[PDB]
Amino acid sequence: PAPELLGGPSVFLFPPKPKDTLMISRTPEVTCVVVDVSHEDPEVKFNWYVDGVEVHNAKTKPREEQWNSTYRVVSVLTVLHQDWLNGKEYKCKVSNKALPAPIEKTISKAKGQPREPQVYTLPPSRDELTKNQVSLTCLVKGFYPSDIAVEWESNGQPENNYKTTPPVLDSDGSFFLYSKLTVDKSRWQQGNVFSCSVMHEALHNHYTQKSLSLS
Amino acid sequence: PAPELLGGPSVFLFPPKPKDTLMISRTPEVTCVVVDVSHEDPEVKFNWYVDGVEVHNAKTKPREEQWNSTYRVVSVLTVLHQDWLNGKEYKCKVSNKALPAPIEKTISKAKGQPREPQVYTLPPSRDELTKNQVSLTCLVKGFYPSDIAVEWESNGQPENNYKTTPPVLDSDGSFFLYSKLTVDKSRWQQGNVFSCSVMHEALHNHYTQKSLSLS
Amino acid sequence: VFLEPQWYRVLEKDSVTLKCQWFHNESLISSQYFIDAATVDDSGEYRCQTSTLSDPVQLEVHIGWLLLQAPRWVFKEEDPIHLRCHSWKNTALHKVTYLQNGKGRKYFHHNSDFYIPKATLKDSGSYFCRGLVGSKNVSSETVQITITQ
Ligand SMILES: *[C@@H]1O[C@H](CO[C@@H]2O[C@@H](C)[C@@H](O)[C@@H](O)[C@@H]2O)[C@@H](O[C@@H]2O[C@H](CO)[C@@H](O[C@@H]3O[C@H](CO[C@H]4O[C@H](CO)[C@@H](O)[C@H](O)[C@@H]4O[C@@H]4O[C@H](CO)[C@@H](O[C@@H]5O[C@H](CO)[C@H](O)[C@H](O)[C@H]5O)[C@H](O)[C@H]4NC(C)=O)[C@@H](O)[C@H](O[C@H]4O[C@H](CO)[C@@H](O)[C@H](O)[C@@H]4O[C@@H]4O[C@H](CO)[C@@H](O)[C@H](O)[C@H]4NC(C)=O)[C@@H]3O)[C@H](O)[C@H]2NC(C)=O)[C@H](O)[C@H]1NC(C)=O
Ligand SMILES: *[C@@H]1O[C@H](CO[C@@H]2O[C@@H](C)[C@@H](O)[C@@H](O)[C@@H]2O)[C@@H](O[C@@H]2O[C@H](CO)[C@@H](O[C@@H]3O[C@H](CO[C@H]4O[C@H](CO)[C@@H](O)[C@H](O)[C@@H]4O[C@@H]4O[C@H](CO)[C@@H](O[C@@H]5O[C@H](CO)[C@H](O)[C@H](O)[C@H]5O)[C@H](O)[C@H]4NC(C)=O)[C@@H](O)[C@H](O[C@H]4O[C@H](CO)[C@@H](O)[C@H](O)[C@@H]4O[C@@H]4O[C@H](CO)[C@@H](O)[C@H](O)[C@H]4NC(C)=O)[C@@H]3O)[C@H](O)[C@H]2NC(C)=O)[C@H](O)[C@H]1NC(C)=O
Ligand SMILES: *[C@@H]1O[C@H](CO)[C@@H](O[C@@H]2O[C@H](CO)[C@@H](O[C@@H]3O[C@H](CO)[C@@H](O)[C@H](O[C@H]4O[C@H](CO)[C@@H](O)[C@H](O)[C@@H]4O[C@@H]4O[C@H](CO)[C@@H](O)[C@H](O)[C@H]4NC(C)=O)[C@@H]3O)[C@H](O)[C@H]2NC(C)=O)[C@H](O)[C@H]1NC(C)=O
Ligand SMILES: *[C@@H]1O[C@H](CO)[C@@H](O)[C@H](O)[C@H]1NC(C)=O
Ligand SMILES: [Cl-]
């Protein structure tokens, strides 16, 4: 449908981290990266539009020389947490002499009705208690959109050794995922408490946690 | 209209399905796919090699019109189960008049010590028992390579209402995944035994089963 | 014994024209020479006569998307080094990088020759070019350049 472009700089527009959009102590940023800027036309211009309304206040970094002898230039627009969640479009317009016409890229939060995750912690299987380490599982399902943050905690500090699957599309159009916390078996049997924490837009205070311990 | 296709066609070479390599009754296939074949130079010639030696058993599929006025053109070589698992390289050589030379592509099983999967079934959280459906969970971890197949059954019949996460790289270089089977709560309350079936080269007879029921 | 264009390393389907002051691999020809659309068989040693018998001049025909052409591979300090990143059938090449010893040295949005006007000992190393033919990443083979005094 769209006739393909020739050489020239290229533009990549990146959204904010989910966890940054949801906790108000954090500062979420939209990031507009221009690569393949030649030394012959190294000057790059960033215009930034929210829903159509130009904004200024974007903080443009200075061009950095890449190992392949091209320039790379980043512009970082700080975003208001609620503007992102209400789903306002963010537009990076990149202008440069090697471009016949400026390049525009747009991003926004995935559209669709938000849905609250259900969170269930699952102890280690009985068969696993044979091993030196064991697996505490946190199942998170029924969420939409797929934007989410999941962490494990214990005694107020973040647990180290955990991996979380990518979001998977369940058959009702919602998403689930699983996160696995691996701990030494001593800590489980000695009876410490482990929490699985979940941040998602459709939860009250964008937060919930669920405890897990032996009994 | 037509696209320019300046670089000619491109080749994507795909492996067999994990279950097809692991059950002797099934037929594993390597699939060479060629895209961006033009209307004007649509013929594709295939040469297939196993550890450098030419083989002639490949199947030629009728070419497929795509919705951008190119052909998707495919050749499918069935393979020997043991060869694939023994790490034989399968080379697809693709010739077309819009190329300056043949494109060659190779594929083998991932290399490195195979590691046995550990399989663990996990009953629903007590908090899910209020719902009308429950989630039975199968954790499969500690396996290498990532090639694996997972299915569920009850009472000699397949249970198909499940979803499985992709394999995830764990911190020791092995893989894990979760599979979630969703069943009507009545069925779990009746005392029915559900089973998680896992296939992987590092298992005995490429097969193992763990079971899960009300206690 | 003169090549038009000068490039002694050429690609399949390249036009060559050959000027005199013919023997192909020491053997007689059709005519008394225009190579319309080169093939690998047109490679080899070439000599000229109508005058004396000329020196031996090599024409290498290569197969590939890209070929790093130059008038020679050994240069004097301060000599001009002309590189052409030649694409098969002069197919449009974009986002072209010329590399030296594994590091991108010059980048061009559209294909362009990389002319170094004044060579130095720093310019010794292996060079290749690469780029995009449409969406396809392609690279030429390497060529060794060495700089002397
Ligand atoms: C010359 O070199 C440069 C750079 O050099 C590099 O460094 C050297 C040493 C080497 O290692 C070299 O290989 C390195 O690249 C080359 O520049 C590269 O150019 C290519 C394109 O040719 C770019 O490739 C795209 O990458 C995208 C992903 O990029 C991110 O991830 C990669 C790793 O996978 C990182 O390396 C990048 O830096 C990017 O990482 C992200 O950066 C963000 C901004 O900082 C981060 O977000 C921010 O995080 C901070 C916190 O730090 C805050 O929280 C902010 O709020 C937050 O915004 C983010 O965390 C970080 N991610 C990480 C670390 O994972 C791909 O998306 C893209 O693919 C899309 O586009 C292709 C078209 O070309 C297409 O084919 C693909 O299919 C895909 O399609 C698109 O899909 C998207 C979404 O799915 C849709 O928009 C579209 O539908 C669709 N099509 C589109 C948009 O057209 C490419 O793979 C590469 O990023 C770029 N590198 C850098 C560093 O800029 C250059 O090419 C070289 N030139 C030559 C001539 O050789
Ligand atoms: C014109 O149109 C055509 C047609 O396009 C399509 O139709 C229209 C309507 C659109 O909707 C469009 O989106 C459709 O796709 C265009 O054709 C496409 O071209 C792109 C490239 O431009 C191809 O993209 C690659 O896809 C690979 C994965 O492909 C599979 O998955 C997708 C879905 O995700 C399917 O749609 C594909 O068909 C492939 O599906 C697989 O097919 C196999 C063979 O059928 C199946 O295996 C077999 O299964 C059967 C049963 O059916 C038997 O059991 C056999 O035993 C078994 O063999 C397989 O199951 C099936 N999977 C499914 C369905 O899930 C990507 O892998 C690839 O990415 C790699 O390469 C990129 C380079 O371009 C690079 O960016 C990536 O990083 C990645 O690179 C690799 O990374 C890995 C590690 O991550 C490394 O190991 C590698 O080293 C590394 N580099 C490589 C390999 O170079 C591509 O993204 C796309 O496949 C193709 N479509 C089709 C249908 O073939 C065409 O481009 C258009 N042209 C123009 C000019 O517009
Ligand atoms: C003047 O002198 C020069 C310098 O000596 C000659 O250059 C030589 O030309 C040869 C062919 O014309 C070049 O051969 C090519 O390069 C490969 C070297 O690695 C070579 O392997 C290839 O050779 C083919 O023929 C062989 C059979 O005898 C095969 O072993 C080989 O695989 C190739 O044949 C094809 O193989 C595939 C396999 O899948 C078959 O399916 C095909 O059917 C086969 N045939 C065809 C037609 O494709 C390759 O062609 C040689 O390298 C080159 N040397 C140099 C240094 O450049 C000039 O030709 C000569 N000029 C004249 C007019 O005589
Ligand atoms: C082409 O492939 C190389 C090899 O990995 C990579 O470094 C390069 O950036 C790719 N793209 C281009 C435009 O050169
Ligand atoms: Cl990202």
Structural class of chain C, by secondary structure, is mainly beta
User: What multimeric state do the chains show?
Assistant: heterotrimer
How many helices of chain A does DSSP assign?
3
What is the CATH top level name of the largest domain in chain A? Mainly Beta
- The CATH topology of the largest domain in chain C comes to Immunoglobulin-like
SSE run of chain A:
EHEEEEEEHEEEEEEEEEHEE
What class do helices, strands and sheet pairing of chain A give?
A: mainly beta
CATH architecture group name of the largest domain in chain C: Sandwich
What string gives the helices and strands of chain C in order?
Answer: EEEEEEEEEEEEEEEE
Q: What kind of sheet is the major sheet of chain A? A: 5 strands, antiparallel
What's the N-to-C terminus distance of chain A?
A: 61 Å
Hetero groups in this structure are: a molecule of 9 linked components (NAG-NAG-BMA-MAN-NAG-GAL-MAN-NAG-...), a molecule of 5 linked components (NAG-NAG-BMA-MAN-NAG), 2-acetamido-2-deoxy-beta-D-glucopyranose, chloride ion
Helix content of chain A: under 10%
Kindly provide the radius of gyration of chain A, computed on alpha-carbon positions and rounded to a whole number of angstroms.
22 Å
Q: Compute the CA-based radius of gyration of chain C.
A: 17 Å
Helix coverage percent of chain C? under 10%
Kindly estimate the percentage of residues of chain A that lie in beta strands according to DSSP: 35-45%
**CATH homologous superfamily title of the largest domain in chain C:** Immunoglobulins
Q: Mind telling me the CATH superfamily name of the largest domain in chain A?
A: Immunoglobulins
PDB class: immune system
Keywords: immune system, complex, gamma
Assembly: trimeric
Entry title: Crystal structure of fucosylated IgG Fc Y296W mutant complexed with bis-glycosylated soluble form of Fc gamma receptor IIIa
Written description of the protein model:
The complex is a heterotrimer, with two copies of chain A (215 residues) and one copy of chain C (149 residues). Chain A is mainly β. Chain A folds into two domains: 9-108, no CATH class; 109-214, Sandwich (Immunoglobulin-like). Chain A contains three helices and 18 strands. Chain A has helices spanning 18-22, 81-86, 185-189, and strands at residues 10-14, 29-37, 45-50, 53-55, 59-60, 64-65, 71-78, 90-95, 103-107, 118-122, 133-143, 149-154, 157-158, 162-164, 168-169, 175-184, 194-199, 208-212. In chain A, the strands form four sheets. In chain A, strands 1, 2, 5, 6 and 7 form a five-stranded antiparallel sheet that branches. In chain A, strands 10, 11, 14, 15 and 16 form a five-stranded antiparallel sheet that branches. In chain A, a hairpin with a 5-residue loop joins strand 15 (168-169) and strand 16. With 149 residues, chain C is mainly β. Chain C folds into two domains: 1-64, Immunoglobulins (Immunoglobulin-like), CATH 2.60.40; 65-149, Immunoglobulin-like (Sandwich). Chain C is built from no helices and 16 strands. Chain C has strands spanning 2-4, 9-11, 16-19, 23-24, 34-35, 44-47, 57-62, 66-69, 74-76, 81-87, 94-100, 103-110, 114-116, 125-133, 136-139, 143-148. The A-B interface holds A 4, 118, 120-125, 127-128, 131, 135, 137, 139, 141, 161, 163, 165-166, 168-171, 176-178, 180, 182 and B 3-4, 118, 120-125, 127-128, 135, 137, 139, 141, 161, 163-166, 168-171, 176-178, 180, 210. The structure holds a molecule of 9 linked components (NAG-NAG-BMA-MAN-NAG-GAL-MAN-NAG-...) (2 copies), a molecule of 5 linked components (NAG-NAG-BMA-MAN-NAG), 2-acetamido-2-deoxy-beta-D-glucopyranose and chloride ion (CL). 2-acetamido-2-deoxy-beta-D-glucopyranose binds at residues 95, 97, 130, 132, 137 of chain C. Chain C: Its main location: membrane. Chain C: It is found in: Cell membrane; Secreted. Chain C: Residues 1-149 are extracellular.
